Amino acid sequence: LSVWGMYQHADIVVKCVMIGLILASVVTWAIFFSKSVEFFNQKRRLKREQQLLAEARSLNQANDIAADFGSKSLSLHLLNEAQNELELSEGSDDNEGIKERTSFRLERRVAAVGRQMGRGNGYLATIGAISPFVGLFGTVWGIMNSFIGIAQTQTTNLAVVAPGIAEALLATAIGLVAAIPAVVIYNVFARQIGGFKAMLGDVAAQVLLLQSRDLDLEASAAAHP
Amino acid sequence: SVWGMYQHADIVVKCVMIGLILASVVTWAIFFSKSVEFFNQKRRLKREQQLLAEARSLNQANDIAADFGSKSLSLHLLNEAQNELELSEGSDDNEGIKERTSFRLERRVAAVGRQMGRGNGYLATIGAISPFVGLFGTVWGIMNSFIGIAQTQTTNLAVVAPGIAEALLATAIGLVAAIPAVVIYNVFARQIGGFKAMLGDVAAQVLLLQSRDLDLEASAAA
Amino acid sequence: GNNLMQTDLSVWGMYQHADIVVKCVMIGLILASVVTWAIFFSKSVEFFNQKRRLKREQQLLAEARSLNQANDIAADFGSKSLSLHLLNEAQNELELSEGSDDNEGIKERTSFRLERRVAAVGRQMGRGNGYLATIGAISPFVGLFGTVWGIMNSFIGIAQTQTTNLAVVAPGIAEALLATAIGLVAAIPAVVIYNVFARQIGGFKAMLGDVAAQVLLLQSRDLDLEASAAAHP
Amino acid sequence: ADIVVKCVMIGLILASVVTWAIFFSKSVEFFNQKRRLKREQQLLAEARSLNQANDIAADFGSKSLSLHLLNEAQNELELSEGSDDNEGIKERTSFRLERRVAAVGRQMGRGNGYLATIGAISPFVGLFGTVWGIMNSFIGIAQTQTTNLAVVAPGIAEALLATAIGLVAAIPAVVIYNVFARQIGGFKAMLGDVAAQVLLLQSRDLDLEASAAAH
Amino acid sequence: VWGMYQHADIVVKCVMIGLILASVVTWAIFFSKSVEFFNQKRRLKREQQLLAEARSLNQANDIAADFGSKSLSLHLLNEAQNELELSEGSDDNEGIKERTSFRLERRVAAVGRQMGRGNGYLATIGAISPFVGLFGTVWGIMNSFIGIAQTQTTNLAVVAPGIAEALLATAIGLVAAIPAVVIYNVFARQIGGFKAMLGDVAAQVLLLQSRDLDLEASAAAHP
Numbered sequence A: 001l002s003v004w005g006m007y008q009h010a011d012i013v014v015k016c017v018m019i020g021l022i023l024a025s026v027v028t029w030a031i032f033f034s035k036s037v038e039f040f041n042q043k044r045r046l047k048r049e050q051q052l053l054a055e056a057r058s059l060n061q062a063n064d065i066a067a068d069f070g071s072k073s074l075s076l077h078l079l080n081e082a083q084n085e086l087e088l089s090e091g092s093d094d095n096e097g098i099k100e101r102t103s104f105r106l107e108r109r110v111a112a113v114g115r116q117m118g119r120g121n122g123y124l125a126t127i128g129a130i131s132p133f134v135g136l137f138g139t140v141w142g143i144m145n146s147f148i149g150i151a152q153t154q155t156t157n158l159a160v161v162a163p164g165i166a167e168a169l170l171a172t173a174i175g176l177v178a179a180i181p182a183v184v185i186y187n188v189f190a191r192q193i194g195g196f197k198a199m200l201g202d203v204a205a206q207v208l209l210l211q212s213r214d215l216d217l218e219a220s221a222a223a224h225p
Numbered sequence B: 001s002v003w004g005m006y007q008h009a010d011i012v013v014k015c016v017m018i019g020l021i022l023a024s025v026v027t028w029a030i031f032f033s034k035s036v037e038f039f040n041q042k043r044r045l046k047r048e049q050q051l052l053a054e055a056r057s058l059n060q061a062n063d064i065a066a067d068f069g070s071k072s073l074s075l076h077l078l079n080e081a082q083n084e085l086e087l088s089e090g091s092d093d094n095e096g097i098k099e100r101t102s103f104r105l106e107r108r109v110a111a112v113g114r115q116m117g118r119g120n121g122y123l124a125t126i127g128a129i130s131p132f133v134g135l136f137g138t139v140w141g142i143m144n145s146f147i148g149i150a151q152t153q154t155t156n157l158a159v160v161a162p163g164i165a166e167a168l169l170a171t172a173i174g175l176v177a178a179i180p181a182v183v184i185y186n187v188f189a190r191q192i193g194g195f196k197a198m199l200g201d202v203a204a205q206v207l208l209l210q211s212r213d214l215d216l217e218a219s220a221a222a
Numbered sequence C: 001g002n003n004l005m006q007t008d009l010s011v012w013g014m015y016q017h018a019d020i021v022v023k024c025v026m027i028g029l030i031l032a033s034v035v036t037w038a039i040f041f042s043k044s045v046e047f048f049n050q051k052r053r054l055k056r057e058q059q060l061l062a063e064a065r066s067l068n069q070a071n072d073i074a075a076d077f078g079s080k081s082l083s084l085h086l087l088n089e090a091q092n093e094l095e096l097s098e099g100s101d102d103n104e105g106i107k108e109r110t111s112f113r114l115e116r117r118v119a120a121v122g123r124q125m126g127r128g129n130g131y132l133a134t135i136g137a138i139s140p141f142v143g144l145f146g147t148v149w150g151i152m153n154s155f156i157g158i159a160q161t162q163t164t165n166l167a168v169v170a171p172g173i174a175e176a177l178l179a180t181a182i183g184l185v186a187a188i189p190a191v192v193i194y195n196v197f198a199r200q201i202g203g204f205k206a207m208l209g210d211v212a213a214q215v216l217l218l219q220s221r222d223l224d225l226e227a228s229a230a231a232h233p
Numbered sequence D: 001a002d003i004v005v006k007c008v009m010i011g012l013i014l015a016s017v018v019t020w021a022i023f024f025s026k027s028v029e030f031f032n033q034k035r036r037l038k039r040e041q042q043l044l045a046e047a048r049s050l051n052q053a054n055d056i057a058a059d060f061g062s063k064s065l066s067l068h069l070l071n072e073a074q075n076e077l078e079l080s081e082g083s084d085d086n087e088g089i090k091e092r093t094s095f096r097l098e099r100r101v102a103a104v105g106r107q108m109g110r111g112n113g114y115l116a117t118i119g120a121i122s123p124f125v126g127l128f129g130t131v132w133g134i135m136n137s138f139i140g141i142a143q144t145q146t147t148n149l150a151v152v153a154p155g156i157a158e159a160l161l162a163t164a165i166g167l168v169a170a171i172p173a174v175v176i177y178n179v180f181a182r183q184i185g186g187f188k189a190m191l192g193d194v195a196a197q198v199l200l201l202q203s204r205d206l207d208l209e210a211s212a213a214a215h
Numbered sequence E: 001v002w003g004m005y006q007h008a009d010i011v012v013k014c015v016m017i018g019l020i021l022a023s024v025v026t027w028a029i030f031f032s033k034s035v036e037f038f039n040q041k042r043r044l045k046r047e048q049q050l051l052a053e054a055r056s057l058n059q060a061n062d063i064a065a066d067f068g069s070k071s072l073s074l075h076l077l078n079e080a081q082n083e084l085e086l087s088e089g090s091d092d093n094e095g096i097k098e099r100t101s102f103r104l105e106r107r108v109a110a111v112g113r114q115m116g117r118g119n120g121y122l123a124t125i126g127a128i129s130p131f132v133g134l135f136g137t138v139w140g141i142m143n144s145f146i147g148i149a150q151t152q153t154t155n156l157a158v159v160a161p162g163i164a165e166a167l168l169a170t171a172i173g174l175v176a177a178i179p180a181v182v183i184y185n186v187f188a189r190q191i192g193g194f195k196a197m198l199g200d201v202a203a204q205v206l207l208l209q210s211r212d213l214d215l216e217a218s219a220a221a222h223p
């Protein structure tokens, strides 16, 4: 029969397989659309902030440039951690310590943001990996039930069992149609999350470089009046 | 008709089905016990991390964590650092203290990570060998099918059907055992990674407090 | 019953034995093949030229016994020269640090900068290889979809028209298999080209890291020799 | 019958023999190594200085791992006598202990490769056997001319036996391989723990000594 | 297997000849790189044993003098001496140490990379040989199904040849794929071990240099 009349004419287990695979497709495309608009906005904002800080030339100038980036700015956050470390460290003779403590801080928040970016990629990787074998389960179960049928009666003449076989194969087709776009989407999102991490670490590095240079130049100006 | 499929079938395939069945049960037991364990451990650690965010020195962190409980992971990290300070008493070299402390604490995070994945070994091997076992069953079934053609001498469809049915059942059960073990192993591996990361953040907070405090004490003496 | 009235057809008459879905799988796979080969031909000449240029720069700078001599060597390398960019970054760090007492800081900052740049370049080399790895990964399974859908249609044919024989849905079965065959032919060159690019990119990264390391070593040694000559005249 | 099918089957059973040899011998090795290290680490728990750790380990047996790590640290101190730079000693000692620990891990892993591959490829040489046999059968039905698969069916069943055996060979290879891999993991952690204790003792004693010498 | 491959299809003839060339390449790579790794690891193991006796960099240089021109150890020692000569006149021994370790660990990496050469081809052959064999079989059964119609009968004898050629493609695909991947893994493991040993020799060189710098500095400070 049709693909439709072929679905509900199948075994309850095979029905389950087909419906589950279709829902998997829905989750794939939902994740795709939302995360796509998200990454485009964040990448634009970060690129803008980064090129504005490119001119910074000191850490206080960078703070002045970043003042209006918004409270949700990742650059503003990294700059604020460096400022927080300096202020907590007021009175210390050891600039190496400040530098150490600041690098540890920035590198850790960058890492954390990357871990936010990937939330949901676990579902994509899992769907693309497991969908073909789930479809495969469906068709194996369907054809298994078919052959359990042919030796009961017990028949010959393949044309009689053909519909159950076709209905079973539809399960594998749906399994593949679910997996392939999941795999593709997973690949692009991995590439973009990597690129985003790289950009964010670029800003964090700008911050550390400014802080390091500032500490050294100030210590030198203080040692020789 | 699964109970009817169960022994309608060959002794070898009875073995395949029962063994794989057990594989599934151990898989899901592991899933439920360790999964609830991870929910609880994560919830407790996240709470302790919030309370300790309010600490502006190490002594205050120790005061905040005092009543965290006997098995608290944050309390263990703080105490490891306190132990290094106590053992290093009288030393002029704060770089040495900092170094020794990080080494100890990071070495601790790793170990906690190692014991979270303790059950994962079983999952990894089950998902590893379940298709093999399954495949054996199905290879057995098709083999029997040819014995039918040989003993019956009639090559119609009704003769080959039992072996094909058996074989397919073995493949189906092989998939049911293999797939969840594999994805559960991956989910647990991810959860362990995030937990190691959170715990590493608490250790980081401890190290930063100790480093800043040492520097400030040394400057107040100069 | 005896003899026949029928026959089969050629490649164009096989195409007539697939449904609309399988026709799409085949044509889409073949276009996929075209993008793999365009990627290959475009990136190949690019990589070759940059690799020759960099190889020359690296051999010439390997002779530099000092950071000043290295600057003289690279003087006219061109505006787009990667080596010249690394040297200019080291010079920039020295210049931004003018007035500082701490040479460790300069060394630290310079290494942090240069290593960063090398990594970025690697990323700018990897552009498009994701298309290759993805094409080589999923093309055999796109082909498999074609095959599964085809045999499904064949079993529908067996079911509506009774009895059996074959001869009817047999061409459709052959066409379905053909879809997997085309899938494999799409996957293989993608996988091989991809491996070649992974190797060549690895070597290019090593060459850049060699230039970068030579720059850092010259800067480190020169800072220390200057510091020692300033302490003890 | 045929020829190569039976050689696939025998080569698989040979592979099984190798699997079992590795299993028994490695079982002994890992269990004795783990027991020795566990005790050594418990006894070293008490030492309040590097010297106290050497003295405790001094009768561990000549092949003890803990005693070797301690002797590396002691050797580095002895070689560096006369030196005013304790950061150097520390550095050198860590480098040594890191290398030595790594090398020991290398040795403990040896032979696990054979398990990994036997478990990986054993079902495919099995498959090769059946494919070869059934290929022979189907050149057989091409010869003469037959129908009624019943003539060639027993040969085809014999051919499948080769895959069956391939899977049987692979299964224990794979399990033993996993068990031994978790073992190598635990052991590397234990060895790193003793190494770490050595480094901490030496570092702390170097610092308390340098301070007391200044004042 | 003689008349057989003579009567086959041109495409399947291509998959077969390609697969067997893959096989010959794997075994050529295997024999040459096998003896090469054997000789190099013998040489290095002897050198590491002999250098374990050095109590300083000069003593190591005397031990290594006749190691030969192709010796990796001599290369490492000469590199470390070169760093000492270029830094002559510098008061900063931290710098010297830093520069030296950086150089040696990169030389080690480079040797590893140079041995990783050609293992790529094994990795690629082991990667695509199942795809080619599998293509062969897919083509074979495709052609057998084309065979049944026309003549438009089922039976067996015209269905059997396509089955025979497909199975042949699988078999030769296995014979090409399996040894290529196994050899690739064995060589990757050997390369890892050699790189670790070489790093061990390098570390010996670094430690001797470090200790000598510190002892010279101490003998100058407290004469």
Ligand SMILES: [Ca+2]
Pocket: none
């Ligand atoms: Ca220092």
